[PDB]
Structure formats: structure tokens, C-alpha cells
């Protein structure tokens, strides 16, 4: 697995 | 997208008293469609919590679960994927890759989910996908106490699964991504 950066989508990212 | 929460080895209340606060802030109602739990909730407190997150909750029996009604294993279909679920204390020696590949063959699944080791893994072997979410609370295991709290969220659409791994490490939530395509 690849670590995500600040801008990247993930499903629990607040919106 | 079908969102599946994968978690287990909570060991609440005997080893840990709750999920990390930063995990609870992220895990909110209304987003998750299915929960696949490797077991060792040990108690109804945690089952009840999972039901706040999604209606469709699947648990398999852990070696420390109070609830004996949970099935030992389960096979489910989400999107195009056949997924197998087992706690994995039945794997001898613990976490053995040959043992996991043997369970994959016995269940005939595209994705095998198992627990027990309290160590996260997400990898493709012989074109099959293997997931272990770790312990969502960072509960100690039979060998070790430096356990990183973690869980997985699979985002399934058709032939593609994107697996997001959430870890509480360095006091912060770290997210990692891996992708698997059905052959």
C-alpha cells in the first residue's frame, strides 16, 4: 500500500 | 461505489476500552454500506456500535467472543467479488501464508479476510487478494503489545477494489491505498 498525500481522496475524508 | 468497513480484534472491554478517538471521529453514520468483522468484539457493546455505522453487519466468531451465535466463517458477494471471512485462530502456525493460501483454496474466494494476528496486511498472491485489518483498538496479541490500531475500508466497484488502510501512528491517522483487480 501507498501512503496518501493531503490532497488525495479517501472515503472517510471529511467534506 | 460499495463501501465495506473491515475490522476486528477489538477486545473491548478486557484488553481495550474503546476505539481511538481519532478513529471514532472519522467513522460516522451514513457512509458505509457493509461491515465485515473478523470477530473478537467479545461483547454486545461493540456490536451495537457497528450497527450505528451500517445496518448490514457481518461478524464471524473469534476465540474470545461471548456471542456463540456468530458463524465460524462466512462467504459473501459484494459487487463482482466473492469474499471469505474467518477470524483466523484456526490458522496454525498463526498468520502462515501457506495456511492462508490453503483457506483461499478451500473457500474458493477472490478476497480472503482474516484476523487474529493484530497486524495489518493487504496483498495479492497468486492473483487472489488477502486482507487482515489488524486490531481496530491496538489490542495486545498473544505475543506482543506494540500493536498499531488499524482498520480497512474497501471501495468496490465492479471488477476493481481500492483498499484504504487507516492506522493510528505517531498520534495521527495515516491512510494508505492499494488496488486489486479481479483477473
Residue numbers in the entry:
A (entry chain X): 24 to 38
B (entry chain Z): 0 to 182
Sentences copied from the publication:
The Commander complex is required for endosomal recycling of diverse transmembrane cargos and is mutated in Ritscher-Schinzel syndrome. It comprises two sub-assemblies: Retriever composed of VPS35L, VPS26C, and VPS29; and the CCC complex which contains twelve subunits: COMMD1-COMMD10 and the coiled-coil domain-containing (CCDC) proteins CCDC22 and CCDC93. The COMMD proteins form a distinctive hetero-decameric ring stabilized by extensive interactions with CCDC22 and CCDC93. These adopt a coiled-coil structure that connects the CCC and Retriever assemblies and recruits a 16th subunit, DENND10, to form the complete Commander complex.
Two interactions unique to Retriever further promote VPS29 binding and regulate its function. Mutation of this interface with VPS35L(I761G) or complete deletion induced >50% reduction in VPS29 interaction (with CCC complex retained), while reciprocal mutant VPS29(L67D) reduced binding to VPS35L by approximately 30%. The second unique VPS29 interaction involves the first ∼40 residues of the extended N-terminal region of VPS35L (see inset (iv) in Figure 1B). The first 17 residues form an intramolecular interaction with the carboxy-terminal region of the VPS35L α-solenoid, with the same structure predicted for all VPS35L orthologues across species (not shown). A synthetic VPS35L peptide (Glu16-Ile38) representing the predicted VPS29-binding sequence showed modest affinity for recombinant VPS29 (Kd of 1.8 ± 0.8 μM). The conserved 34PL35 side chains of VPS35L bind the VPS29 pocket defined by Val174 and Leu152 respectively, VPS35L(L27D) and VPS35L(L35D) mutations block peptide binding by ITC, and immunoprecipitations showed reduced binding to VPS29 and the CCC complex. The VPS35L sequence binds VPS29 with high affinity, which is enhanced by intramolecular tethering and thus blocks Retriever-bound VPS29 from participating in these regulatory interactions. Incorporation of VPS29 into Retriever is therefore mutually exclusive with its ability to function in canonical Retromer-mediated transport, which also explains why synthetic macrocyclic peptides targeting the conserved pocket on VPS29 interact with Retromer but not Retriever.
